[PDB]
Design an enzyme around this catalytic site. Structure first.
Site, mmCIF file in Angstrom:
data_model
loop_
_atom_site.group_PDB
_atom_site.id
_atom_site.type_symbol
_atom_site.label_atom_id
_atom_site.label_comp_id
_atom_site.label_asym_id
_atom_site.label_seq_id
_atom_site.Cartn_x
_atom_site.Cartn_y
_atom_site.Cartn_z
ATOM 1 N N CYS A 1 0.791 -1.203 0.451
ATOM 2 C CA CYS A 1 0.381 0.302 -0.367
ATOM 3 C C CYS A 1 0.753 1.093 0.346
ATOM 4 C CB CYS A 1 -1.103 -0.021 1.156
ATOM 5 S SG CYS A 1 -0.044 -0.800 2.682
ATOM 6 N N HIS B 1 -3.502 6.024 4.520
ATOM 7 C CA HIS B 1 -2.140 6.079 5.057
ATOM 8 C C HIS B 1 -1.534 7.373 4.545
ATOM 9 C CE1 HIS B 1 -2.172 1.763 6.368
ATOM 10 N NE2 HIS B 1 -2.061 1.679 5.352
ATOM 11 N N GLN C 1 1.138 5.586 8.808
ATOM 12 C CA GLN C 1 -0.244 4.637 8.545
ATOM 13 C C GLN C 1 -0.929 3.900 9.255
ATOM 14 O OE1 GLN C 1 3.720 1.915 6.893
ATOM 15 N NE2 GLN C 1 1.903 0.565 6.603
ATOM 16 N N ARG D 1 3.518 2.751 13.038
ATOM 17 C CA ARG D 1 1.841 2.708 12.702
ATOM 18 C C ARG D 1 1.187 3.853 13.540
ATOM 19 N NH1 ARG D 1 -0.609 -0.727 9.214
ATOM 20 N NH2 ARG D 1 0.049 -2.784 10.676
#
Ligand code: NA
Lengths: 364, 365
Positions: free
Chosen positions: A135, A270, A162, A263
């Protein structure tokens, strides 16, 4: 008429794919078949019902009859099934989200606004495995596509922010729940620094605040490790970036990609701070111009506060096909480096959309 | 006979963290504290401040004038109102300040004594009186890679920050907590996961349901890649502060560029930073860790593996502490001389309060 089988459809990428297909009339000229591991032989609820009974994901005979299979299931499923199918003589198209097959010489990575002409060449040359990229690579490449097409990029540092969706639906549920619980225990009347402390200590108790899925509490937190350890020092998440980008662009000259994957407590978009070194010096207005012409999804956000806070965010971007990109500025580091910040939806351009689009290329 | 030290700003977050750090360190022992205020003047404050007497007036120019040293966590509006009036009114005492107003005057010295102690001393010595804490991003970065900066090994630094709400003040934090509270109430476990996300998302955007004036937009389940005022270069003021302050602190012959982007995230008091550092010399990754690990006593290296990274290289882990955590230290594909790392430290302490406390000590000595 093409017999297309769907594995993975129950999860998030899979629902987003279904929804995108309904919206685009992508079922119109195919015979869909919907694979499962639960209520097999049963009529699913929802539109899928019109295609009949759920067949068995692990049945090798049933899978074999499909002309094309499309998996959002995962790598454990691809490792455990894909080889059995080729071993069992099946010569159909395997379109996959999982990362397992990404780097095999037989595989083509799909991101058609960048490598359409190559997907076609692969199908044409009897290649059968078409895999969605990570991604982060998908979302980056699309944002600065107008620089990459002109082969103007020498290298890219990315620092990602993310969202939890990339980790699956139970991880997200976990994040929402962590946040819920901590919100209950939090007391408005208590002193602000004491509240922070109370949340902080509570966040660490795995028997009060569930954190098995995020490993630690993600709420009011950051996690600067995504995936598995590499011997280079990178996570697997991070090493992906360079090799995939170069496979997608099929570069003569490798373009290094590096940085850190983190994260954060976002749900499906994102974000990425990019520091890009160019092959030649360009004014900042030339850089925006090029960026703005990379594809129809790129959405430039002008470099000022009101517009940045309103549009260059997960809030603004989640649910949409927009590749927002802003804060485009020159750099003090070098006359050829610029900075920008981008945001895109993990589930769509990050996972589902490229798959849907390559299906269309294979079927027509 | 003893130094008379006045405190402005003590009620807020930086200010409480400073008080707490002073109690803990016995930093009241050899001074005559006086506690200034803008409301309950003449009142006996509750807590330990009680023992120093009544609250004096923050805006009274006479009362401030008698202090040998004043220490403000009040803000730039206050420094703007008042600092000039004091110098205009003859006062030649030491002004230690958190706000950014005075950071770049030639008369000012930026304080971060594990890096520029020798200079603070030279400044005091040369009859300089203005000592200002740097921006939190600079303080936290410089400390983390101090061991490279001291050896003048750093050519430049890209930083991407993941900044906590505390730097914005106590009402902004309250706002963040509240946004999150309200969104949590509306959220229903039984509803489909993508529908829940949608519901939160749409609710977050309603300024009449979810208060967002302080953060401008909802910060919960979000991030804000704009901090502070627009600069004509393209940077925010937050981002331009980095290079000039770092070079002022190190007093470099040769400017070390610092650039990147500053982003607000839903953390409470710890700033995190992904650093991409270009060196002047190629160094093995072990030499880099070594140097980093010897920058000062606060630098805390976190071994580059998952269990340790998730447990220690995080706001959760670091908030409340003086640790400058730094990890994910690795070589880079970009160039043989570039390395990457990620660091985390506490905005309120090393980011705001601690440097001030420590320069106070250098002055009282
Ligand atoms: Na360590």
């Amino acid at each position: 008429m093409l017999k297309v089988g769907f594995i993975g459809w129950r999860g998030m990428v899979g629902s987003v794919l279904m929804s995108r297909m309904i919206e685009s009339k992508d079922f119109d000229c195919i015979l869909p078949t919907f694979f499962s591991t639960s209520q097999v032989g049963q009529l699913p609820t929802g539109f899928m019902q019109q295609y009949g009974a759920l067949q068995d994901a692990y049945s090798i005979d049933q899978l074999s009859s499909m002309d094309i299979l499309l998996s959002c299931q995962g790598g454990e499923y691809t490792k455990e099934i894909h080889h059995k199918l080729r071993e069992a003589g099946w010569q159909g198209f395997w379109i996959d989200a999982a990362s397992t097959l990404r780097l095999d010489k037989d595989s083509t990575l799909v991101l058609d606004p960048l490598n359409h002409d190559q997907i076609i060449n692969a199908i044409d040359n009897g290649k059968k495995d078409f895999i969605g990229s990570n991604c982060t690579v998908s979302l980056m490449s699309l944002a600065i596509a107008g620089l990459l097409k002109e082969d103007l990029v020498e290298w890219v540092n990315s620092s990602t922010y993310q969202a939890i969706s990339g980790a699956g639906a139970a991880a997200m549920q976990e994040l929402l729940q962590q946040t819920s619980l901590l919100s209950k225990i939090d007391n408005r009347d208590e002193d602000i620094l004491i509240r922070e402390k109370i949340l902080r200590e509570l966040s660490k108790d795995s028997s009060k605040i569930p954190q098995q899925k995020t490993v630690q509490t993600l709420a009011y937190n950051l996690l600067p490790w995504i995936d598995v350890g590499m011997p280079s020092g990178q996570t697997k998440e991070e090493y992906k970036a360079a090799t995939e980008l170069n496979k997608i662009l099929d570069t003569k000259k490798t373009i290094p990609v590096d940085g850190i994957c983190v994260r954060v407590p976002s749900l499906r978009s994102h974000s990425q701070a990019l520091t890009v070194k160019l092959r030649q010096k360009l004014t900042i207005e030339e850089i925006k111009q090029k960026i703005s012409q990379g594809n129809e999804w790129v959405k430039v956000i002008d470099n000022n506060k009101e517009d940045t806070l309103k549009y260059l965010t997960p809030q603004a971007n989640s649910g949409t096909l927009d590749i927002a990109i802003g804060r485009i500025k020159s750099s003090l580091l070098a006359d050829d480096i610029f900075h920008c910040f981008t945001v895109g939806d993990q589930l769509l351009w990050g996972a589902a959309e490229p798959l849907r689009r390559v299906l269309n290329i294979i079927k027509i």
